Paper text:
[name] ([name]) DNA gyrase is a type [name] topoisomerase that can create temporary double-stranded DNA breaks to regulate DNA topology. DNA gyrase is a bacterial type [name] topoisomerase that can regulate DNA topology by making a temporary double-stranded break in one DNA duplex (in the gate or G-segment, forming a so called cleavage complex) and then passing another DNA duplex (the transport or T-segment) through this break; this is accompanied by large movements in the enzyme. DNA gyrase and its homolog, topoisomerase IV, are targets of well-characterized fluoroquinolone antibiotics (e.g., ciprofloxacin, ofloxacin, levofloxacin and moxifloxacin), which continue to be widely used in clinical practice despite serious safety concerns. Such compounds, known as topoisomerase poisons, stabilize intermediate DNA cleavage complexes formed during catalysis that lead to accumulation of DNA double strand breaks and bacterial cell death. In vivo type [name] topoisomerases are believed to use Mg2+ ions to cleave DNA; however, in vitro, both Mn2+ and Ca2+ ions can also be used by the enzymes to cleave DNA.
Here, a 2.58 Å anomalous manganese dataset in this crystal form is solved, and four previous crystal structures (1.98 Å, 2.1 Å, 2.5 Å and 2.65 Å) in this crystal form are re-refined to clarify crystal contacts. Finally, an [name] DNA gyrase binary (DNA and protein) crystal structure was also determined, based on data collected at an X-ray wavelength of 1.33 Å (E = 6.6 keV, above the Mn K-edge) (see Section 4 and for details). This structure shows that, in addition to the fully occupied catalytic metals, whose occupancies were defined by ensuring that their temperature factors were comparable to those of the surrounding atoms, additional sites are present with lower occupancies. In addition to the expected crystal contact partially occupied manganese site, density for additional manganese ions was seen near the quinolone water metal ion bridge in this binary complex with nicked DNA. The structure showed large anomalous peaks at the two catalytic sites as well as the Mn-coordinated BisTris at a P61 crystal contact, and unexpectedly, it also showed a new Mn2+ binding site close to both the free 5′ phosphates of the 12p DNA on both strands in this binary complex and close to the side-chain hydroxyl of Ser A84 (or Ser C84). In standard BA-x nomenclature, we named this site E or F/1999. An iterative refinement strategy was implemented to estimate Mn2+ site occupancies, in which the correlation between the Mn2+ B-factors and the B-factors of coordinating residues was optimized. ijms-25-11688-t003_Table 3 Table 3 Mn2+ site occupancies compared to anomalous peak heights. In our experience, this P61 crystal form tends to grow as two crystals joined by a merohedral twin plane. The anomalous data were collected from two such crystals; therefore, the crystal structure is modelled as a near perfect twin.
Numbering used by the authors:
A (entry chain B): 417 to 545, 580 to 640
B (entry chain D): 417 to 545, 580 to 639
C (entry chain C): 10 to 490
D (entry chain A): 9 to 491
The structure:
Amino acid sequence: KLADCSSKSPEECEIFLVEGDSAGGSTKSGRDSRTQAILPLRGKILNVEKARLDRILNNNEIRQMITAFGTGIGGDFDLAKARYHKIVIMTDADVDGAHIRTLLLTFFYRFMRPLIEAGYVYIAQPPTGYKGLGEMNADQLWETTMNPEHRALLQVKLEDAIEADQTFEMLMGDVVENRRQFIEDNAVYA
Amino acid sequence: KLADCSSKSPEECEIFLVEGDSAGGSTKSGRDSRTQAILPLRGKILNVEKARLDRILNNNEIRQMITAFGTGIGGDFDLAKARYHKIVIMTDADVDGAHIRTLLLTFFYRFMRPLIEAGYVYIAQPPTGYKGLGEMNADQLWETTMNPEHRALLQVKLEDAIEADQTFEMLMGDVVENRRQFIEDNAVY
Amino acid sequence: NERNITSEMRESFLDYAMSVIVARALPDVRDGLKPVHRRILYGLNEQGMTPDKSYKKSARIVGDVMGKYHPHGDSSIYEAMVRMAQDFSYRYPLVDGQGNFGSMDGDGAAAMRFTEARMTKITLELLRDINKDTIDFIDNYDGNEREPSVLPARFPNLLANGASGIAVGMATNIPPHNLTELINGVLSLSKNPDISIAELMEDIEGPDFPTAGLILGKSGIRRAYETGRGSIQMRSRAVIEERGGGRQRIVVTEIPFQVNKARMIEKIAELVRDKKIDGITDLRDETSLRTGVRVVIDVRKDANASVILNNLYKQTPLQTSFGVNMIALVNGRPKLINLKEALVHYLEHQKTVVRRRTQYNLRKAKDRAHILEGLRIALDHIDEIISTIRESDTDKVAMESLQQRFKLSEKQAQAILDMRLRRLTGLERDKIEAEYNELLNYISELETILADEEVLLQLVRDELTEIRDRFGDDRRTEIQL
Amino acid sequence: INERNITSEMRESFLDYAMSVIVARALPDVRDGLKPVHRRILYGLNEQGMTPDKSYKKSARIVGDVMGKYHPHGDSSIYEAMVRMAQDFSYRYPLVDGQGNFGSMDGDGAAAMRFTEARMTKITLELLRDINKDTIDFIDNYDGNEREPSVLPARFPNLLANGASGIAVGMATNIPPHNLTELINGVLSLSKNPDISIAELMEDIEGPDFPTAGLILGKSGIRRAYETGRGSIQMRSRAVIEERGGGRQRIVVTEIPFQVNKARMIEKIAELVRDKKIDGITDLRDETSLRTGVRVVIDVRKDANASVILNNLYKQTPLQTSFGVNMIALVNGRPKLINLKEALVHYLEHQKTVVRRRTQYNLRKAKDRAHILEGLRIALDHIDEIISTIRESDTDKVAMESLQQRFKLSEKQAQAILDMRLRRLTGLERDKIEAEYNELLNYISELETILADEEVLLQLVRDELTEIRDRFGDDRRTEIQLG
DNA sequence: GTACCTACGGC
DNA sequence: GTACCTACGGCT
DNA sequence: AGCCGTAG
DNA sequence: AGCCGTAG
Ligand SMILES: [Mn+2]
Ligand SMILES: [Mn+2]
Ligand SMILES: [Mn+2]
Ligand SMILES: [Mn+2]
Ligand SMILES: [Mn+2]
């Protein structure tokens, strides 16, 4: 379901990973088609912290993201073959949008950690509110999140490696109890 | 998507052909299940007067109906292997339910005419109110249309076969003008 | 009992056919709408989804239509509604949408869970004066609602937006036109019932598609208009320009009506792979919201780009026919109509609507005058009124005493009992006298319209002309000879 | 600040999603036993005036309203939730009144939301009863264009009655359904003894009561669940062994456990025989109809101990299933594992609060009314001067100000007069005022007394609970077999 | 009118 | 969360 | 040949 | 296992 750009110049190229076929249409129409690609995701993606490798590799979502990035995975990861020096994550800005972001970040950290370290990974800042991405025209997506001169993109900084490891394990792994205790400790029911 | 009965005596076994998977579920639930079988259709079905016999065999619904009946086609037919003696057509009492009826009769006439001839073909009379099939509980479908006691099947009889040929080729055939003439002739606005 | 097969086919197929011709796939000649559309618009109306108000979600709107008017699939209704809100589908769009409503790449809309819609201002003119006994309402499918048989349609919607329907045993294919030209055509017809179609084409120069583009010649136009059927050649807007170093390129900025842009480029890239065309080195879609449609084809050096352009018109949808087939519902039965007939029918509809509205306006005016005549009698003799009421036990005895004592109708006497103490202040007494005086002048003006058919006819002219001045726009499609 | 530590983003994002799912998706409220989707559906039927006296409405329209007005999520989620509430085999006391195909025990999916219709049941009335008497705290909706309830008044213990199940984050919930008659007898005992033990309560509430009946083996698992909030309860089908002719026998099953699929269970039994993992079974049939209720037949091979076959079937098939009790619910908008007494305590407090707030409302409302009637007496008594004052005046404002000064009326009594219709000047209207006023004062006294005493308020709750228990209570279905 | 992919926790 | 199957006419 | 647009 | 039921 990928829709690529014209430029073969990875430095200037950017790929947007969006939530829902619904919003994929909109962003497909409002972008700069020359240097901006788009790949829509059907809802919740696989959580690679729990899944084993066979299942990760047969999953189409994962597949489409590896192919479009063109760096390979694990040991075979080659940053030189980066097709975009900006991979940008774009979700609804609700609690489900959050969850989808955590899944994508988990995938990158466990399978494409150098992308993060190389700073190629960004997070989009769409307009917050009651409305989500599927309920927006193509012009109001350009002007707020895809227009370079107007948007504000948060780059993803990886610093303490071991802290990131234990965080991903705790928040996304199969042991529930550590998750539960984390929620209890930090849950601020306003 | 087929659901058979338990009895393997075709003399008493009945099969109903329902319109849409919604109605499909309803009927599978209210039936007798001992002598009554159900096979739904996922909407409008192929018109076998306009298909060069190449795609007719790619149509999953076509293939499923053959399998259910347990006979064959045309020159390779056999009435004596028919798994049922009542093949009942049951569709919405609206004009789309009628069209589908016509698409089934066409399939029967050009492929299982002996079943029409054998009178094994019937047409269910669901409550002729505005309410479709998918919109009815199971108990209603039983008492009004499925129950052998209260229901009211119409049996299909094949008469002037030459005339039937000419009719089937005007209404369903690829010459629109003759169809258009028939509409204008018999139009009652 | 039993049923002949041959008789059952005839009966059952004939029912389906008529139910697709009327009540599905052909437009009405008077409002140019098919049932699904009319039910969408009436729904948008009865839900109060006007341009002033904020949008509502499409799921709610499609939910209401399916349940109150249109007993079919939500898809058959949302899809119909999506096409009504696409500037590239409708020449004058009837829905105002929010969210992804599709693009020219065969790009679907977003889910109805997401998009939202309201009316456009021109839809207002479709529905204007519907609640004023201008058209006939009928019962819905279950008898639990009432729906319009046709809309007031204060502009010629059939020809403005066109139509396409694959019926049974027939089809219709009508192209969009330009609103300014149509109304002027109607105004000419209104002044001379014997005007010729040749004379009318001095107004209506031809179809006018939302996507602009070209038309080649008027021989297909004149045939379609005079007979109902014609074939009309469309082409893209394409120029040849240089790109640098003697190399040229072709730039396409407008494509034909109802042509998938992505499908067309595929066909181009396909013809290139299969070597079915020569001289093409690159092909990009440089299209955006900020520059509009722009499809470039880079030409190989020293190669005749005009030759390549001419072969692309032969081998791609860059050139496309439109088969005009003007079959509409006239008096509830399908009919292939010329242009004049289509305008004639719409005009007699406007006559009807405006006259019905005037009579409705007149009845309601005299009713409200009658009520106020009684209120003024009450003010004139308020002392006696209060006496009369205080002296009664029930509402009925009071109502009978008033009628008797002051020679009031029952409605008048009721209007007096229902009056609130507040309406006795200096200003409320004045408002009542004032409403009376204005209503009398108004009644007079209504009777003057109904007294003469030329004044009615002229009133129709004025209201069309106002619509034209406010909503009429420039021709987009160029008709080239 | 156009950068983000990956650890911090993951921490805040996941915490945001967990909390949201816990307190706003998957866990029920301890007061009304309802999840936000379910609360919005019911609030939707009410606001749409879909009471059970009203005919059925297109479900699509209902889900449309709910989705637009209060619940901005997938229509499939809302509808399926509405479906479950209308299923007698899912809900022990069903809340939605379904017209159309709403599914079967075979995982027969319900028909599409354009094909179904629905309205409230009589018992949902008791859930929503007194919603418009300031009994519960309303809040804004997602877009700020609506008001939705934060909790239904819930005049019967809905949580324990229809039960709950939800997978959340960090935690899941599994509360079984109960018999309303026992619940009410339990709450009443509680209200008569704040220091009542769990054993004493179980004298009323024997154990769960599933809408599918069946058996429960022993009170050990139940006791643990009611005391700790957690425990395993063994649900067994109702099978009997009988003669099918010629010395042959057969096992006949007429009730299956809660949340078991009939078709899928038959697959497993068929699979067992096919793979030869159990011997002595000649045939398997599903002879279930409208008329016979549920009936699964298992033909036992001649000369086989059909009781041994039966025992193996329990062991190796869903014929016997366990229910992992895990009574988690929101208390003060926080998840908590509660035992049975906690759940009954929080509910009684809810009922006390509800009935208390209803009374204050009625008091304020009656007081306001009487204050109007006094303004009306004075009006009718001087009707001649009232009108002159009104007539002599240019504006409403001038009228109002004159009225108040001249007749000692508050602004809202002067308005009440200006709004009055001439037909209120009739002969015996003065008496209706005089009759209504005195009746009002009577009512006022009654209300103030209820608020004067706590024991009277509590007695009012007991009486309104007893009514419900007598009108809605029904026999237990699940047999708790002591073995 | 499908086949239906995913997260989430507890058996 | 997102699917493709069919009828129907006329145009290519 | 298959694609347009309301339908199952 | 995979299935319970709200979500994407
Ligand atoms: Mn969202
Ligand atoms: Mn139907
Ligand atoms: Mn479809
Ligand atoms: Mn007088
Ligand atoms: Mn879904």
